[PDB]
Amino acid sequence: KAVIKNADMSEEMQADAVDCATQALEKYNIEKDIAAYIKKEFDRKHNPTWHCIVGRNFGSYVTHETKHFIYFYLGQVAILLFKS
Amino acid sequence: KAVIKNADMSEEMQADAVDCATQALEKYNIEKDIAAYIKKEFDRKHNPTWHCIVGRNFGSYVTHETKHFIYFYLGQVAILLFKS
């Protein structure tokens, strides 16, 4: 459930991420729709740009925004998010 | 098997990415280091926001400036390289 590994934002820009991801996982059945939903909701919530990666067999060097980075799990799904 | 699923680039950029990804995947066993090396090499060559991602259960739809995306399947691995 609430499992966070590496969070680089403040408490609200982590808790809102957890909540939105939770509602996304409970709504959709599609990983691609999860990614698109996170992007859309965070774009209309915080700032014009929001970039997320969702899956279970991935991992990669990535240039996020300084102070902007989060990585967590939901059941088994690695979900990462950041600003550009 | 070099198979390209989706892309939006020029042919020269796509071929450069194909060859660089081929050499990186053949060299490094772990997807993490493969993506690390690829993204660093395209940081050195092109825009310093190139994102290289790798996996077998990977998906991410993020807001982007166009013309710099590719998502292909080589052998039994999915490799993405894009810029936002």
Partner: peptide, 10 residues
Amino acid sequence: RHIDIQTDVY
């Protein structure tokens, strides 16, 4: 602004 992560091989 350059980070590395993958986790929980499955």
